[PDB]
Amino acid sequence: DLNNLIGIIAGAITTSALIPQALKIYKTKSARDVSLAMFIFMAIGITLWFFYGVLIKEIPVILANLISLILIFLIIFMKIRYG
Amino acid sequence: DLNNLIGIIAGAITTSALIPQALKIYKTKSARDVSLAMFIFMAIGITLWFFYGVLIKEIPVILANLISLILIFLIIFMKIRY
């Protein structure tokens, strides 16, 4: 399936993109310059993208968003912890 | 109908969510903690989500990701200036 392959690949990449931001905050224990607003609103939007994926029945949309949400929450947690 | 309502609303939220990070770098003139790798990888991935949207023919996926790409380059630009 061409569509899902591309979808999984897009989602593998956008979700994993969050890992370097997480690791950086963790390694340096600082996130002063990181925008909390961005991740706050990203989280809600991403939760809506999840719902959307469920309605149109598309697994790559579903998966990428659930997992990004976990990773985004880490980032939010470290922004608050190292503040 | 319902589908477009959620997609568009999602796309409006996640796309606009990128704006505060650009504004923050510009206002504080600092981007040390911001990860350049994250945004480079997001650009590539979002670019693929755009292809995906066209393939599965979902306009909210297509449009949200195009506007997002512009904003990500915008962010990348200010990460580098500061």
Ligand SMILES: CCCCCCCC/C=C\CCCCCCCC(=O)OC[C@H](O)CO
């Ligand atoms: C179909 C979707 C396409 C429409 C997308 C609309 C959303 C973009 C909004 C703002 C970003 C544009 C900002 C323009 C670029 C700003 C960077 C700049 O001006 O740099 C200054 C100069 O390079 C240094 O002196």
